Design an enzyme around this catalytic site. Structure first.
Site, PDB file in Angstrom:
ATOM      1  N   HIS A 229       0.812  -1.210   0.000  1.00 29.53           N
ATOM      2  CA  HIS A 229       0.000   0.000   0.000  1.00 29.53           C
ATOM      3  C   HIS A 229       0.850   1.266   0.000  1.00 29.53           C
ATOM      4  O   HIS A 229       0.324   2.378  -0.032  1.00 29.53           O
ATOM      5  CB  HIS A 229      -1.011  -0.001   1.157  1.00 29.53           C
ATOM      6  CG  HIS A 229      -0.439   0.375   2.489  1.00 29.53           C
ATOM      7  ND1 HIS A 229      -0.057  -0.560   3.427  1.00 29.53           N
ATOM      8  CD2 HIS A 229      -0.253   1.585   3.068  1.00 29.53           C
ATOM      9  CE1 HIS A 229       0.334   0.058   4.527  1.00 29.53           C
ATOM     10  NE2 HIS A 229       0.223   1.361   4.336  1.00 29.53           N
TER      11      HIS A 229
ATOM     12  N   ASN B 174      17.872  11.549  11.532  1.00 24.87           N
ATOM     13  CA  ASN B 174      17.032  12.741  11.421  1.00 24.87           C
ATOM     14  C   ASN B 174      16.745  12.939   9.933  1.00 24.87           C
ATOM     15  O   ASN B 174      17.616  13.365   9.189  1.00 24.87           O
ATOM     16  CB  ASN B 174      17.745  13.978  11.966  1.00 24.87           C
ATOM     17  CG  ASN B 174      16.835  15.184  12.013  1.00 24.87           C
ATOM     18  OD1 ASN B 174      16.156  15.494  11.035  1.00 24.87           O
ATOM     19  ND2 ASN B 174      16.807  15.869  13.150  1.00 24.87           N
TER      20      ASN B 174
ATOM     21  N   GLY C  51       2.500   6.667   8.762  1.00 24.32           N
ATOM     22  CA  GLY C  51       3.865   7.043   8.442  1.00 24.32           C
ATOM     23  C   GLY C  51       4.878   5.964   8.784  1.00 24.32           C
ATOM     24  O   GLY C  51       6.034   6.042   8.367  1.00 24.32           O
TER      25      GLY C  51
ATOM     26  N   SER D 241       4.068   2.766   8.153  1.00 24.24           N
ATOM     27  CA  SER D 241       3.749   1.734   7.172  1.00 24.24           C
ATOM     28  C   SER D 241       4.945   1.306   6.343  1.00 24.24           C
ATOM     29  O   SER D 241       5.744   2.141   5.922  1.00 24.24           O
ATOM     30  CB  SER D 241       2.648   2.215   6.219  1.00 24.24           C
ATOM     31  OG  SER D 241       1.415   2.374   6.890  1.00 24.24           O
ATOM     32  N   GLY D 242       5.041   0.001   6.103  1.00 21.64           N
ATOM     33  CA  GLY D 242       6.127  -0.543   5.308  1.00 21.64           C
ATOM     34  C   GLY D 242       7.367  -0.828   6.130  1.00 21.64           C
ATOM     35  O   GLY D 242       8.283  -1.520   5.670  1.00 21.64           O
TER      36      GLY D 242
ATOM     37  N   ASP E 227      -0.030  -7.616   1.786  1.00 19.39           N
ATOM     38  CA  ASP E 227       0.483  -6.242   1.764  1.00 19.39           C
ATOM     39  C   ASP E 227       2.004  -6.258   1.867  1.00 19.39           C
ATOM     40  O   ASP E 227       2.577  -6.040   2.934  1.00 19.39           O
ATOM     41  CB  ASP E 227      -0.130  -5.447   2.927  1.00 19.39           C
ATOM     42  CG  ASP E 227       0.119  -3.950   2.816  1.00 19.39           C
ATOM     43  OD1 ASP E 227       0.527  -3.476   1.733  1.00 19.39           O
ATOM     44  OD2 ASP E 227      -0.108  -3.242   3.822  1.00 19.39           O
TER      45      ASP E 227
ATOM     46  N   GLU F 264      19.659   6.750   7.605  1.00 19.85           N
ATOM     47  CA  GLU F 264      18.946   7.889   8.165  1.00 19.85           C
ATOM     48  C   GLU F 264      18.645   7.822   9.656  1.00 19.85           C
ATOM     49  O   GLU F 264      18.463   6.745  10.218  1.00 19.85           O
ATOM     50  CB  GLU F 264      17.607   8.051   7.435  1.00 19.85           C
ATOM     51  CG  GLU F 264      17.711   8.555   6.011  1.00 19.85           C
ATOM     52  CD  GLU F 264      17.838  10.057   5.961  1.00 19.85           C
ATOM     53  OE1 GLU F 264      18.302  10.622   6.963  1.00 19.85           O
ATOM     54  OE2 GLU F 264      17.491  10.675   4.936  1.00 19.85           O
TER      55      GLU F 264
HETATM   56  C1  LIG Z   1      -4.440   6.391   8.072  1.00 22.84           C
HETATM   57  O1  LIG Z   1      -4.449   7.057   9.391  1.00 22.84           O
HETATM   58  C2  LIG Z   1      -4.192   6.443  10.667  1.00 22.84           C
HETATM   59  O2  LIG Z   1      -4.221   7.091  11.741  1.00 22.84           O
HETATM   60  C3  LIG Z   1      -3.859   4.873  10.745  1.00 22.84           C
HETATM   61  C4  LIG Z   1      -2.444   4.628  10.214  1.00 22.84           C
HETATM   62  C5  LIG Z   1      -1.796   3.299  10.590  1.00 22.84           C
HETATM   63  C6  LIG Z   1      -1.010   2.630   9.620  1.00 22.84           C
HETATM   64  C7  LIG Z   1      -0.384   1.387   9.916  1.00 22.84           C
HETATM   65  C8  LIG Z   1      -0.546   0.807  11.202  1.00 22.84           C
HETATM   66  C9  LIG Z   1      -1.345   1.443  12.250  1.00 22.84           C
HETATM   67  C10 LIG Z   1      -1.486   0.844  13.520  1.00 22.84           C
HETATM   68  N1  LIG Z   1      -2.454   1.102  14.379  1.00 22.84           N
HETATM   69  N2  LIG Z   1      -0.653  -0.064  14.021  1.00 22.84           N
HETATM   70  C11 LIG Z   1      -1.966   2.713  11.904  1.00 22.84           C
HETATM   71  N3  LIG Z   1      -4.809   3.930  10.060  1.00 22.84           N
HETATM   72  C12 LIG Z   1      -6.129   3.867  10.305  1.00 22.84           C
HETATM   73  O3  LIG Z   1      -6.665   4.454  11.247  1.00 22.84           O
HETATM   74  C13 LIG Z   1      -6.998   3.007   9.396  1.00 22.84           C
HETATM   75  N4  LIG Z   1      -8.227   2.566  10.099  1.00 22.84           N
HETATM   76  S1  LIG Z   1      -9.737   3.045   9.542  1.00 22.84           S
HETATM   77  O4  LIG Z   1     -10.810   2.247  10.400  1.00 22.84           O
HETATM   78  O5  LIG Z   1      -9.673   4.598   9.750  1.00 22.84           O
HETATM   79  C14 LIG Z   1      -9.865   2.714   7.849  1.00 22.84           C
HETATM   80  C15 LIG Z   1      -9.963   1.364   7.353  1.00 22.84           C
HETATM   81  C16 LIG Z   1     -10.071   1.174   5.932  1.00 22.84           C
HETATM   82  C17 LIG Z   1     -10.071   2.321   5.065  1.00 22.84           C
HETATM   83  C18 LIG Z   1     -10.181   2.199   3.594  1.00 22.84           C
HETATM   84  C19 LIG Z   1      -9.969   3.628   5.603  1.00 22.84           C
HETATM   85  C20 LIG Z   1      -9.866   3.834   6.981  1.00 22.84           C
HETATM   86 CA   LIG Z   2      19.485  12.669   7.641  1.00 24.44          CA
END
Ligand SMILES: COC(=O)[C@H](Cc1cccc(C(=N)N)c1)NC(=O)CNS(=O)(=O)c1ccc(C)cc1
Ligand SMILES: [Ca+2]
Length: 223
Positions: free
Chosen positions: A40, A54, A175, A177-178, A84, A52
């Site tokens: 994603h 800072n 942020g 993610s990945g 994913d 990296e």
């Molecule tokens: C996108 O904004 C956010 O605050 C988190 C990010 C995130 C990313 C990876 C891991 C975590 C974690 N908690 N460990 C969090 N995701 C969400 O809050 C998504 N949940 S959700 O219920 O808001 C949702 C589900 C499906 C769609 C299409 C859109 C939104």
């Molecule tokens: Ca740097």
């Protein structure tokens, strides 16, 4: 990373930042020319930043390398986030050293109760927003499937695992993610998704890397 701690400069040598004009996702260096991240996080024009700490200050140990090819898992489902995972090949091989090093792929799947290290430059607040400039770290155990197949609102396939705390307060976030989830010294997971961040009874969901080793090895051997 919510509720974590400052890792310390280059203490997580395999951590990478994916940059498209700004940091948007993390990743893991598995060898001198390949990076594993979340599907994603796919985007064109990706520049991989290694060494990296800072991300807003050039400190001297960085290596910026453009991606030459991106390969999203053949069965990735963007709606459920099943499979994913994505592979990124660097245009040129990175120079491996003390501050930039690869992380090994697992030969077996990690057991519930095992403590893992999760890292990233993601949001540090469960309510609101605040992005750090230096890498944050979090110690989190792998939870039993039972502990979240009942805690997660979405579908948790056999290609994912939950890690974190049911009490909330500590979790990965936007942020991150990945990014890597390392347990027993190997890459066991990829930061994938969750419901909000550090919410009670809503632990993070991670891609179970041990189920993808065959695909990763076959792909890197032919690309
Ligand atoms: C996108 O904004 C956010 O605050 C988190 C990010 C995130 C990313 C990876 C891991 C975590 C974690 N908690 N460990 C969090 N995701 C969400 O809050 C998504 N949940 S959700 O219920 O808001 C949702 C589900 C499906 C769609 C299409 C859109 C939104
Ligand atoms: Ca740097």
């Amino acid at each position: 990373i919510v509720g974590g701690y400052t890792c310390g400069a280059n203490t997580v040598p395999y951590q990478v930042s994916l940059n498209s004009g700004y940091h948007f996702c993390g990743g893991s260096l598995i060898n001198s020319q390949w990076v594993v991240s979340a599907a994603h996080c796919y985007k064109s024009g990706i520049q991989v930043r290694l060494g990296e700490d800072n991300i807003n200050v050039v400190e001297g140990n960085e290596q910026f390398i453009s991606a030459s090819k991106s390969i999203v898992h053949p069965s990735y489902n963007s709606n459920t986030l099943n499979n994913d995972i994505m592979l990124i090949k660097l245009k040129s091989a990175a120079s491996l050293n003390s501050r930039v090093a690869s992380i090994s792929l697992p030969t077996s799947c990690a057991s519930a109760g095992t403590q893992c290290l999760i890292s990233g430059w993601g949001n540090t607040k469960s309510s609101g927003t605040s992005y750090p400039d230096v890498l944050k770290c979090l110690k989190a155990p792998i939870l039993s499937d039972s502990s979240c197949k009942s805690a997660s609102s979405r579908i948790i396939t056999s290609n994912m695992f939950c890690a974190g705390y049911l009490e909330g307060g500590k979790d990965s976030c936007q942020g991150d993610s990945g990014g890597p989830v390392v347990c027993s010294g190997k890459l066991q997971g990829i930061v994938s998704w969750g419901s909000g961040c550090a919410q009670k009874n809503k632990p993070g969901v991670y891609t179970k890397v041990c189920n993808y080793v065959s695909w990763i090895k076959q792909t890197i051997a032919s690309n």
